[PDB]
Structure of C-type lectin domain family 2 member D:
Amino acid sequence: LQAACPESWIGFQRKCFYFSDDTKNWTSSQRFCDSQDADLAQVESFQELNFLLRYKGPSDHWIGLSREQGQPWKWINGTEWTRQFPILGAGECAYLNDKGASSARCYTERKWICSKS
Ligand SMILES: [Zn+2]
């Protein structure tokens, strides 16, 4: 069985997911997730990516992947991104659109996805 999640959260595999209604910048989105004892979505596989794309909706959604320029992608914990899928764009913060994962300026405002075990 998949994980049992709190209200308004969706269970997938060993994680619970929250799809936001409103828009925030990347750091503010992470701040929301942290307040829920969670983090911006840690997308560790293509299966996980497809799940999110399926249930995300039309708007772009922040996820928990960021990089300083000319540095590799990093999850929130600090572990280096393991290249499971391509991340288009030249931005510092990663988000999901309808097609896949892209990147943008962190101060732009988007919906977001939180995840936790
Ligand atoms: Zn945290």
